[PDB]
Amino acid sequence: SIWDAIAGCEAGGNWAINTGNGYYGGVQFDQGTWEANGGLRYAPRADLATREEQIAVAEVTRLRQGWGAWPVCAARAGAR
Numbered sequence: 248s249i250w251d252a253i254a255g256c257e258a259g260g261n262w263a264i265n266t267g268n269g270y271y272g273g274v275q276f277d278q279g280t281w282e283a284n285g286g287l288r289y290a291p292r293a294d295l296a297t298r299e300e301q302i303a304v305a306e307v308t309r310l311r312q313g314w315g316a317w318p319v320c321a322a323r324a325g326a327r
Contacts, residue, residue: 249324249325249326250273250274250298250301250302250305250324252320252323252324252325253273253274253305253317253320253321253323253324253326254273254274254298256317256319256320256323256324257270257273257274257275257317257320258272258273258274258275260273261273262294262297262298262301263294263295264294265292265294271292271293271294272292272293272294272296272301273293273298273301274293274301274302274305274317274320275293275317276292276293276301276304276305276308278292280308280312280316281293281304284304284305284307284308284311285304285307286300286304289303289304314326314327
C-alpha cells in the first residue's frame, strides 16, 4: 500500500491530521486540490474523509497531476 508510505512521510500516518498549515489529512492535500479531484463527494476536507476515501481522491490526483503532488514523499514511498 504505497499510500501508507506516503502518509507516514507526509503526516506520520495520521490520516485525520489538521494542523493549520494549509494541508489536510494523511497525504496533506491542500483544499483546492481536494476539491478539484472530487473530494467533496466524500467529505468537506481530506482530514474528514476516511483513509480509503482520501486514497481514492489521491489516485485521481496522481493520474491527473503526477507524483509531483507529493515532492519528496512520493520518492520515499518508492514512487513511479
